[PDB]
């Protein structure tokens, strides 16, 4: 599915992301529109052989078992497939924890580059919340 801004906006409030560890809605709509342009059915492959999944492209070498990323961990205790889903309730799960972790959101390159330091809330300016 490809979510459309405000529609994936109030999904991602809706299941508690706004203000998660600090982080305020506009951030994790930002990212989710340069990790994957807001397709729940991205998929990347990396140069070690992991690959990264959904919305907001989680990798299975820590988060998600794919069964072909060798001496990995499923540290979110899913498939990697759940993470394609039309719901996104899988994806904000597993992304809850991995933000969680020592780094927050600079886990994401693409929030990292193209997010952080900006006008996040302009993400989220037109939709009734
Ligand atoms: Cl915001
Ligand atoms: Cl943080
Ligand atoms: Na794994
Ligand atoms: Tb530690
Ligand atoms: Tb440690």
Redesign the pocket.
Same mark, same amino acid.
């Given at each position: 599915k490809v979510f459309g801004r405000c529609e994936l906006a109030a999904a991602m409030k809706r299941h508690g992301l706004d203000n998660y560890? +600090?982080?305020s809605l506009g951030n994790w709509v930002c990212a989710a529109k340069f990790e994957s342009n807001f397709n729940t059915q991205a998929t990347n492959r990396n140069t070690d052989g992991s690959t990264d999944y959904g919305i907001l492209q989680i990798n299975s070498r820590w988060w998600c078992n794919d069964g072909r990323t060798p001496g990995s961990r499923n540290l979110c205790n899913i498939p990697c497939s759940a993470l394609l889903s039309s719901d996104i309730t899988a994806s904000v799960n597993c992304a809850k924890k991995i933000?969680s972790d020592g780094? +927050?959101?600079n886990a994401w390159v693409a929030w990292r580059n193209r997010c952080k330091g900006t006008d996040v809330q302009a993400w989220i300016r037109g939709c009734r919340l």
């Open positions: 560890r +600090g982080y933000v780094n +927050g959101m």
